[PDB]
Design a protein around this ligand. Structure first.
Ligand SMILES: OC[C@H]1O[C@@H](O)[C@H](O)[C@@H](O)[C@H]1O
Length: 301
């Protein structure tokens, strides 16, 4: 048995974490894992070709463009590979999810609410007037899970007294630190009126981009509360800095579920024809400098 695990962004430690747990599944269940990075449609196509050359019987993929769904499905079928998605759900030409592809991702809207609640609570601890705070929304709205994460955060912040008029959309060219850094700088330039800011994106990587941009403009840790999603090494790098940064916290996700449980679901689908769960939406909890080590250890991460 051989299973492919194809990821859009190998330089995001979340996917490295999925891979590490998928490797644990491989050793445990006695299958061979083939790890492939595919940050573009061209590289997805070659990844699936490689997996077929190696006689893999299944592939789990977080595609770089969810609209590649139909092509991915057609090739996997041609090559006799069962197909499962992780993180980013594959969709058809009208943006409807592929009904025959089992998926595991996060409960994105609820996770976003947690981001906004975390931010609101820290702002309150600092005595900030929420009605006067700039709300930097790093946006990559073309991807549903990203849109839902930021919508939840905004909704939680408005529920806590942050002003709709102070929500500054910062649309990203790419959903990565570079994209966020550039989008944040554009937003800060237009909104020099705010003294205090909060920021968030789709993940730790994007969030940190805004924190770095703020630092370059004299918006440091006292004037910035930013909370990410993943709780992997980008969050941990901020938490380990000798001087705390404006990256205040992150919603810790569980890459054992996304890496180990998906791989087992695939294994059992291949070997026993067990119907995979069609949709699993996972949960998270807030980590900050104060609890990150404990929280991660209590998940075995
Ligand atoms: O499912 C969680 C993952 O979702 C992806 O869209 C994102 O790129 C990852 O960094 C991680 O947040």
């Amino acid at each position: 048995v051989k299973i492919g695990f194809v990821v859009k962004q190998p330089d995001d430690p979340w996917f490295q974490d999925e891979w590490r747990f998928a490797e644990q599944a491989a050793k445990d269940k006695h299958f061979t894992l083939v790890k492939i990075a595919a940050p573009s449609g061209e590289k997805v196509s070659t990844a699936l070709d490689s997996l077929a050359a190696q006689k893999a019987q299944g592939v789990i993929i977080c595609a770089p463009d969810v609209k590649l769904g139909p092509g991915i499905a057609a090739k996997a079928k041609r090559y006799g590979m069962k197909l499962m998605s992780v993180d980013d759900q594959l969709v058809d030409g009208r943006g409807a999810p592929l009904a025959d592809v089992p998926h595991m991702g996060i409960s994105a809207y609820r996770i976003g609410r947690q981001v906004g609640d975390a931010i609101a609570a820290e702002a309150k601890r600092r005595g900030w007037n929420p009605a006067e705070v700039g709300v930097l929304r790093l946006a990559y709205d073309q991807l549903p899970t990203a849109r839902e994460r930021t919508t939840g955060a905004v909704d939680a912040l408005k529920a806590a007294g942050f002003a709709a008029a102070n929500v500054v959309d910062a649309p990203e060219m790419t959903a990565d630190t570079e994209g966020a850094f550039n989008a944040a700088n554009i937003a800060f330039t237009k909104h020099r009126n705010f003294r205090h800011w909060v920021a968030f994106g789709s993940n730790d990587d994007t969030t940190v981009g805004a924190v770095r941009a703020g630092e370059g403009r004299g918006i440091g840790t006292d004037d910035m509360i930013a909370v990410g999603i993943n709780g992997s090494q980008v969050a941990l790098n901020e938490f380990a800095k000798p001087k705390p940064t404006g990256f205040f916290g992150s919603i810790l996700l569980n890459p054992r579920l996304h890496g180990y449980d998906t791989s087992v679901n695939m294994y059992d689908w291949i070997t026993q024809n067990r119907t995979p769960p069609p949709l699993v939406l996972t949960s998270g909890t807030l980590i900050t400098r104060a609890n990150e080590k404990t929280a991660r250890a209590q998940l075995g991460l």
